[PDB]
Design a protein around this ligand. Structure first.
Ligand SMILES: CC(C)C[C@H](NP(=O)(O)[C@@H](Cc1ccccc1)NC(=O)OCc1ccccc1)C(=O)N[C@@H](C)C(=O)O
Ligand SMILES: [Ca+2]
Ligand SMILES: [Ca+2]
Ligand SMILES: [Ca+2]
Ligand SMILES: [Ca+2]
Ligand SMILES: [Cs+]
Ligand SMILES: [Cs+]
Ligand SMILES: [Zn+2]
Length: 316
């Protein structure tokens, strides 16, 4: 909408207070004009029609329980925009400052979040498996990263290319979580998953197998559920990324860690310059090796570490 940029205040899903960029024109709308061509957050009102209505508020204060998922979807989209711009010199998901749109309160008891080809969408959860999913910064960045992937490598959402698509979203979701630097970890969704169980998460990148996800290519899922295991076999790539950054010895193979920032540079370059819609795990290894060679040189530790990490997870 046309209006003037304003700054509201509210509380997110976990009860934390934060400022949000809004737009005033009769109402205060969740429209952040400070980033690209805008970040826009909508109310889906417990229905499945999208996007719903641009979020409107009478007083620019967002402390109601019903407001909390919108506050976080809007704020964490801003953080994710900042990460891609400041760290990778990428302007929104399309590289040309496309407007970023999110809807919250999607459906009833909806235990998921998604990118629908045009926008992000967040359920409220059923209060048992999830609380409102925009409360997880890693979740928000996971979803926006699907948009980045769709505009770049275009990895098809099935089998190995789809597991790479998923891992890219978990990797950058985690790197955004570290960028914001509030309780960062290598787990996925811990802030919104299972409010009655402490210390768990939807997935683990540091130890995927804690939930039965594979941590080696010889344990990959080969069936048809989950689009051929895209959220399962992602563990193999998540583990490799974790090893590249943090190091470790895994199935007897030692990896010298090179840190999160170099992991992000290598995988961002792989995603945007080398991967294609049909890339498999072996082709991802080759893309990461070439990306590290471009950035750091063929004789570099960074290249050696990429090879060690894929060796450790059984990907040649
Ligand atoms: C991080 C976690 C809290 C949420 C995360 N959801 P997500 O993987 O982003 C998923 C959502 C979805 C919902 C409904 C139908 C299909 C898919 N896909 C998705 O948005 O694809 C976007 C895409 C991919 C490829 C090409 C175009 C577009 C997830 O790990 N969900 C688990 C529980 C699961 O669904 O098993
Ligand atoms: Ca209000
Ligand atoms: Ca965390
Ligand atoms: Ca996390
Ligand atoms: Ca939990
Ligand atoms: Cs789990
Ligand atoms: Cs399969
Ligand atoms: Zn996903």
């Amino acid at each position: 909408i046309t209006g003037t940029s304003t700054v509201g205040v509210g509380r997110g899903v976990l009860g934390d207070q934060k400022n949000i960029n809004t737009t005033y024109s009769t109402y205060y709308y969740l429209q952040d004009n400070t980033r690209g061509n805008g970040i826009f957050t909508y109310d889906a009102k417990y229905r499945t029609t999208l996007p719903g209505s641009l979020w409107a508020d009478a007083d620019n204060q967002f402390f109601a329980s019903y407001d909390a998922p919108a506050v976080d979807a809007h704020y964490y989209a801003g953080v994710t925009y900042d990460y891609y711009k400041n760290v990778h010199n990428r302007l929104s998901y399309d590289g040309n400052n496309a407007a970023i749109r999110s809807s919250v309160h999607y459906s009833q008891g909806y235990n998921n979040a998604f990118w629908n080809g045009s926008q992000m969408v967040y359920g409220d959860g059923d209060g048992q498996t999830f609380i409102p999913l925009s409360g997880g910064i890693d979740v928000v960045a996971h979803e926006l990263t699907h948009a980045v992937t769709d505009y770049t490598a275009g990895l098809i959402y099935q089998n190995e290319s789809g597991a790479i698509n998923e891992a890219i979203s978990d990797i950058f979701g985690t790197l955004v979580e570290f960028y914001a630097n509030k309780n960062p970890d290598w787990e996925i969704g811990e802030d919104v998953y299972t409010p009655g169980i402490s210390g768990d998460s939807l997935r683990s990148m540091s130890d995927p197998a804690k939930y039965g996800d594979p941590d080696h290519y010889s344990k990959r899922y080969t069936g048809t559920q989950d689009n051929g295991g895209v959220h399962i076999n992602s563990g193999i790539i998540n583990k490799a990324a974790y090893l590249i950054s943090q190091g470790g010895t895994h199935y007897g193979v030692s990896v010298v860690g090179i840190g999160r920032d170099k992991l992000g540079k290598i995988f961002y370059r792989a995603l945007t310059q080398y991967l294609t819609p049909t890339s498999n795990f072996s082709q991802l290894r080759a893309a990461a090796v070439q990306s590290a060679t471009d950035l750091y040189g063929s004789t570099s530790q960074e290249v050696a570490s990429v090879k060690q990490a894929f060796d450790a997870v059984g990907v040649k």
